[PDB]
């Protein structure tokens, strides 16, 4: 079923029917290109992958020539070496003289490409000159100078097929061809900024990071995205103090070399509103103070209030470290109170399902299994919003194979074709027994997918009890080699927190605390906090969580520390620190160590490796990094998820409203960054953001 051929003497075998350029990549003979891409449709617009083929009258493009057996591929024919210089020279007679103002200085693929294979001179010295192109306003996210564009089609095929915003397009013939809406209307898909990593010239580039640095100055650091349930494998570009930008480093499973929009532009809030020193409340006024004085005030007011048990509330947030929450849980339960609750509304109890049986809070199919998916249904979520990388996988599957999606709850605009069913758990229960009890029994590799917003609803448990019956009832959705129950989170950390055992007891859910511990956790209200409560915030920037506080503690953000994160898939991933904590911020668990020391609590560690062993004690799957194991406990896990909230939850007719208010305003950084404020204003039902 495979084909062996010869590229430059190198024999190489590749699967039949594939493209020749992948065979050149497999053989190790580097062939330059401009408009081939792996994850995209193939168009031969670039003319760069010209290559000599025995039994061919003319040299042909290697991107779209299909693999045939008995093939002799030559790349160094003098005709081909002529041809590459030719095509480069043809490309470089309307591209404008913008190399010192173009953003991709060292990263111009065209440019490095034109050093190997370019001509010495360029005989453009015509009088009346090149063409020139309109400014083409698009949005506040994507800087646009269409003069530098070469119509390499790589933007528009992506936003067409995978991003699913078909507003981009090619309009006009010859040099009157342009790219984009000639309405001059606003583009938005929920992964909008992914085109500026994709246009190989600086036609489309980064608007907030417009000219601030330049890719030879940069220090690069491979790390993990947060404020996203997938925890995409990213790269931090940093000058050394600030954080310049983020670019998705390639990874096969988790992101297929794509990244969320909010994940992209989040570096603005990472440098503008940060906590740089500890501030103690005077009474309607904070003053900054000695780093001893803050923690000594913590110990002093602990001796004043004395929470002896079930009065030390400890709440963590959305982008918080697993390694920090270990220190948190250790401190609280050596303190003698498991008032250990999430930030979410209806987080003050257990989240209506098992903290046991990791399957209860994880994504049990593979994300790679979504290529093999058949017919699924969302409940109570917008997966276009929550984990837009997942939506990219959904649309790629739906275009590739033949699928069926249902959507129960909020009416969303997908890129793909949804099928709505209702806005009631009774409408849901009607739909399960209506027609898809037959379909999901029929389907080979389906799944069923649940957003985390239903955890907000107090009627979650019966909301589980229906669906927990159905997985139990249908053996097709619950077989050995995968499990159809699949849940997501809004964070990169509440999955890791549910690995920690970050849940209050039924007893701990009752008492109003006296000493509230904020660790991130922006979305608390004045209702969630007691009146006289000791409310020491530990975070990185200034949000609502820092506004209620008594003492704030500058902790490092996700960039500055050696983080450890768990996605909804369950991948334990290292976040390599790109820079040091700025000002007077420190790392979080190191702060909790000293906070223990000014109490009677003795944490048994002082290093990072001893934390790694303590973390191995909580779960050894979190020191064994980034390797996804399945669960051998499917049926017992679903049954134990059924038995707990069985019956006692009485589901009301509350409509399944939207989980989040806006996408680009959450998680204390989209509110910190001014670029997401101006992103938020431009993105609701505007005449440039409307369709018709």
């Amino acid at each position: 079923a495979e084909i062996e051929l010869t590229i430059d003497g190198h024999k190489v075998s590749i699967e039949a029917g594939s493209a020749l350029i992948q065979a050149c990549e497999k053989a190790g003979v580097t062939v330059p290109r401009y408009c081939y891409h792996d994850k995209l449709a193939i168009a031969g617009n670039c003319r760069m992958c010209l290559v000599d083929v025995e039994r061919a009258p003319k040299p042909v493009a290697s991107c779209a020539y299909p693999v045939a057996p008995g093939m002799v591929v030559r790349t160094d024919t003098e005709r081909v070496k002529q041809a590459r210089e030719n095509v480069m020279e043809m490309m470089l007679q309307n591209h404008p003289l913008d190399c010192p103002v173009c953003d991709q200085g060292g990263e111009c693929d065209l440019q490095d490409q034109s050093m190997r294979y370019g001509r010495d001179r360029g005989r453009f010295t015509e009088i009346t000159g090149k063409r020139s192109t309109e400014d083409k306003n698009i949005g506040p996210l994507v800087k646009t100078s269409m003069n530098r564009c070469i119509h390499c089609t790589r933007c528009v095929r992506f936003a067409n097929d995978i991003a699913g915003a078909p507003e981009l397009g090619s309009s006009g013939r010859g040099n009157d061809m342009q790219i984009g809406t000639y309405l001059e209307k606003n583009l938005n898909t929920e992964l909008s900024g992914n085109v500026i990593d994709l246009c190989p010239v600086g036609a489309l580039t980064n608007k907030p990071y417009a000219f601030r640095a330049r890719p030879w100055e940069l220090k690069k650091t491979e790390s993990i995205d947060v404020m996203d349930a997938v925890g995409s494998n990213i790269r931090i570009d940093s000058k050394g103090v600030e954080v310049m930008r983020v670019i998705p480093r390639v990874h096969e499973d988790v992101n297929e070399e794509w990244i969320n929009d909010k994940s992209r532009f989040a570096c603005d809030g990472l440098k503008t509103q940060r906590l740089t020193t500890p501030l103690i409340r005077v009474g309607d006024k904070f003053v900054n103070a000695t780093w001893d004085d803050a923690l000594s005030t913590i110990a002093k007011a602990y001796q004043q209030k004395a929470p002896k048990g079930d009065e030390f509330k400890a709440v963590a947030g959305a982008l918080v470290e697993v390694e920090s929450m270990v220190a948190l849980k250790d401190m609280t339960n050596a303190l003698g109170s498991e008032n250990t609750t999430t930030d979410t509304p209806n987080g003050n109890s257990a989240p209506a399902h098992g903290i046991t049986f990791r399957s209860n809070y994880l994504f049990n199919s593979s994300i790679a299994g979504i290529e093999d998916a058949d017919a699924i249904l969302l409940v109570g979520t917008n997966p276009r919003r929550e984990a837009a990388v997942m939506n990219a996988r959904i649309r790629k599957a739906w275009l590739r194979q033949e699928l069926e999606i249902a959507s129960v709850g909020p009416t969303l605009d997908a890129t793909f074709d949804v099928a709505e069913l209702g806005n009631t758990h009774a409408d849901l229960e009607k739909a399960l027994s209506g027609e898809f009890g037959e379909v999901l029994k029929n389907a080979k590799n389906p799944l069923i997918i649940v957003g985390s917003g239903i955890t907000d609803r107090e009627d979650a448990g019966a909301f589980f009890n229906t669906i927990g019956k159905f997985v139990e009832s249908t053996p097709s959705v619950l077989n050995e080699n995968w499990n159809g129950y699949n849940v997501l989170q809004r964070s990169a950390s509440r999955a890791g927190a549910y690995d920690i055992g970050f849940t209050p007891s039924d007893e701990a859910s009752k008492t109003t605390p006296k000493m509230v511990w904020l660790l991130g956790a922006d979305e608390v209200a004045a209702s969630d906090i007691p009146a006289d409560a000791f409310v020491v915030y530990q975070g990185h920037n200034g949000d609502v969580g820092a506004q209620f506080a008594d003492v704030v503690l500058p902790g490092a953000a996700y960039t500055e520390k050696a983080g450890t994160y768990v996605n909804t898939e369950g991948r334990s991933q290292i976040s390599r620190a790109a820079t040091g904590p700025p000002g007077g911020a420190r790392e979080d668990w190191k702060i909790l160590r000293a906070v223990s020391e000014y109490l009677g609590v003795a944490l048994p560690y002082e290093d990072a490796y001893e934390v790694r062993d303590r973390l191995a004690e909580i779960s050894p799957s979190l020191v064994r990094y980034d390797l996804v194991e399945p669960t051998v406990f499917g049926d017992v896990a679903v049954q134990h998820s059924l038995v707990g909230p069985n019956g006692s939850v009485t589901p009301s007719s509350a409509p399944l409203t939207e989980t989040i208010e806006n996408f680009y305003m959450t998680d204390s950084i989209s509110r910190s960054s001014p670029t997401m404020a101006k992103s938020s204003i431009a993105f609701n039902k505007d005449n440039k953001k409307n369709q018709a």
Partner: protein
């Protein structure tokens, strides 16, 4: 000053050193290149 002599203290810079070889192509863009081996001293082909 106080030891009235020079002392050897560990390194502190005003400006951190910045190389710029991080911007670098992996494959060396020079080609394979022809040979100048003598026709005596390369291996004769069989037949």
């Amino acid at each position: 000053e106080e030891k009235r002599r020079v002392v050897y203290e560990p390194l502190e810079l005003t400006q951190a050193f910045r190389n710029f070889s991080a911007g670098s192509t992996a494959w060396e863009p020079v080609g394979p290149g022809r040979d100048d081996r003598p026709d005596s001293f390369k291996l004769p082909t069989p037949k």
